[PDB]
């Protein structure tokens, strides 16, 4: 028989890296 | 014969984008 | 006839969520 259908897409990827630091504070 | 079983799930996805920048700093 | 071979793996999963917010900024 022919090959079966391709499987489902995989699991979601890992969360992204934490963001950059914020701006400096008030003078 | 009949087509074969479904294939394996795909690989997990790539990591997500970085997070947003943080809050401004303290005064 | 015999069933066919299992199907190929699926596509990669979706990219993950954006990451956590970044650290607060410098004082």
Structural overview:
The PDB classes it as structural protein. Keywords: collagen, triple helix, proline pucker, structural protein. The assembly is trimeric. Three copies of one chain form a homotrimer. Chain A is largely without helices or strands. Chain A contains no helices and no strands. Chain A is rod-shaped, with a radius of gyration of 22 Å. Chains B and C meet through loops of B and loops of C.
Describe this protein with a few key phrases.
homotrimer, 27 residues, little secondary structure, structural protein, triple helix
Shape of chain A: rod-shaped
Counting DSSP E segments of at least 2 residues, the number of strands of chain A comes to 0
| Count of alpha and pi helical runs of chain A | 0
**Rg of chain A from C-alpha positions?**
22 Å
Largest interface: B-C, 27 and 27 residues
Calculate the terminal CA-CA distance of chain A, rounded to whole Å.
Answer: 74 Å
Which structural class matches the secondary elements of chain A?
A: little secondary structure
Residues in β-strands, percent of chain A? under 5%
The largest β sheet of chain A comes out as: none
Helix content of chain A: under 10%
Q: What is the chains' assembly state?
A: homotrimer
PDB class: structural protein
Keywords: triple helix, proline pucker, structural protein
Assembly: trimeric
Entry title: crystal structure of GZZ shows up puckering of the proline ring in the Xaa position.
């Amino acid at each position: 028989g022919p090959p079966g259908p391709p499987g489902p897409p995989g699991p979601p990827g890992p969360p992204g890296p934490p963001g950059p630091p914020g701006p400096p504070g008030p003078p």
